[PDB]
Amino acid sequence: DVPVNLYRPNAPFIGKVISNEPLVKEGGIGIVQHIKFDLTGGNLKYIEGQSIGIIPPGVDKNGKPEKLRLYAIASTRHGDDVDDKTISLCVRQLEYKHPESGETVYGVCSTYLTHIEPGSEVKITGPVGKEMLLPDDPEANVIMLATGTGIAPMRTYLWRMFKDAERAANPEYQFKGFSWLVFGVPTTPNILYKEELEEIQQKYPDNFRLTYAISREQKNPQGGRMYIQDRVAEHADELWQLIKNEKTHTYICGLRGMEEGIDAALSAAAAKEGVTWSDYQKDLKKAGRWHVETY
Ligand SMILES: Cc1cc2nc3c(=O)[nH]c(=O)nc-3n(C[C@H](O)[C@H](O)[C@H](O)COP(=O)(O)OP(=O)(O)OC[C@H]3O[C@@H](n4cnc5c(N)ncnc54)[C@H](O)[C@@H]3O)c2cc1C
Ligand SMILES: NC(=O)c1ccc[n+]([C@@H]2O[C@H](COP(=O)([O-])OP(=O)(O)OC[C@H]3O[C@@H](n4cnc5c(N)ncnc54)[C@H](OP(=O)(O)O)[C@@H]3O)[C@@H](O)[C@H]2O)c1
């Protein structure tokens, strides 16, 4: 019983922004915002791992109304206030140089979202998605591999697993498994949710492990920027040991470029033991224990 499309793109939920809080500390690169919306009055229900569409105001270059952009939900089903009245997103402002013009360009929806004021009414659709759901089993193991805003669904899992108010609100889900987050961002001030992630590891050293790939402050053994797949390769044998456990789920969220390198580290470790990764991975997919959301 997973609710999907309670509000469709043609008839979105309209809710007010409650707050818009900066996640990149001083010295960091660009802007990433934690935005929380009010759902009271409507009936938008959601669970961890799902996404929502935001429809920004305006029309594109062709005179057509702007389409929805999808964003991973960043709060648990209860919302950040733990009262079932809200929903949060974790949004990067898109900013780039035009290939042949040199001008600074900004994305439409991510600029709209990152500069939104509390009290603004926003078009919301969904929730959508069944690919990234957490298992109900409190004895599952959870491997999370995340670049940038890819942390968003991981935040829904981790908070559900480890937040005081969440543990008090979910008596049927007291997590006892092993949890491992590998998180790739460019700088320390760019570590989204740093303090809260570090708080979790301190309180649950046996249930949660936190590994960073800080791409501009750390180098991989081969001279390059420290990326996710370099952390993966570094712990490849242990991770493969853990993936072989039938209770283990793996979640990948962020850049598609992280996948090729993850498969190569694991293909190597799995071959040491006479197992062809790509076929085993095929089975994991079918059994629904390999979860991928790249964009
Ligand atoms: C499943 C899913 C989940 C997502 N979750 C999140 C999330 O949690 N947080 C988040 O911030 N985003 C997330 N996104 C991405 C998000 O949906 C938007 O795509 C993003 O915010 C940019 O939208 P925009 O409207 O700001 O940019 P737009 O105005 O739509 O512009 C994007 C277009 O800009 C062009 N572009 C980009 N770079 C260049 C370049 N270098 N040179 C020339 N053109 C370029 C491309 O044509 C691209 O299609 C997710 C996407 C998907 C599909
Ligand atoms: N990471 C994502 O979730 C994602 C998804 C789609 C698009 N993007 C692009 O990145 C911009 C910012 O993204 P955002 O804040 O989520 O992420 P952001 O903080 O940049 O974090 C992305 C991390 O991925 C690293 N990285 C770059 N190329 C990689 C590769 N091939 N394999 C593994 N890791 C790699 C980046 O390192 P360096 O920059 O130091 O190389 C950085 O540490 C977006 O506006 C978009 O242009 C990112």
- Type of residue numbered 156: T
Whether the Cβ atoms of residue 197 and residue 210 lie closer than 8 Å to each other: yes
Among 87, 112, 128, the domain-final residue is 128
CA 235 vs CA 180, 211, 271, 281, 290: distances in Å: 12, 10, 15, 18, 18
Query: How many folded domains does the chain comprise?
Result: 2
- Same domain for 98 and 193? no
Residue nearest to atom 14 of ligand 2 (CA): 148
The residues with which 128 forms a beta bridge, in sequence order, are: 51
Rg (the chain; Cα; Å): 20
Whose C-alpha lies nearest to ligand 1, atom 5? Answer: 71
Separation of 94 CA from ligand 1 center, angstroms?
7
| 141 and 256 assigned to the same domain | yes
The DSSP code for 188 is S
Say whether both 16 and 114 belong to one domain.
yes
Domain boundary among 112, 128, 144: 128
Strand 51-55, strand 121-128: pairing: antiparallel
Q: Is 233 in the pocket of ligand 1 (CB under 6 A)?
A: no
Give resolution in angstroms: 2.3
As beta bridge partners, residue 53 has 70, 125
Query: What tokens does 139 get?
Result: 């004895």
Query: Are residues 26 and 171 part of one domain?
Result: no
* 180 shares a domain with 190: yes
Both 65 and 113 in a single domain? yes
**Burial class for 144, CB neighbours closer than 10 Å (0-12, 13-18, 19+):** buried
- Cβ atoms within 10 A of the Cβ of 196, count? 13
DSSP output for 69-102: EEEEB-S-TTTTTTSSSEEEEEEEPPEEE-TTT-
My answer on whether 107 and 142 are in the same domain is no
Residue 119: give its domain's CATH number.
Answer: 2.40.30.10
Q: Domain range holding 159?
A: 129-295
Q: Choose one of 86, 113, 128: the last residue of a domain.
A: 128
- Identify which ligand lies nearest to the alpha carbon of 114: 1
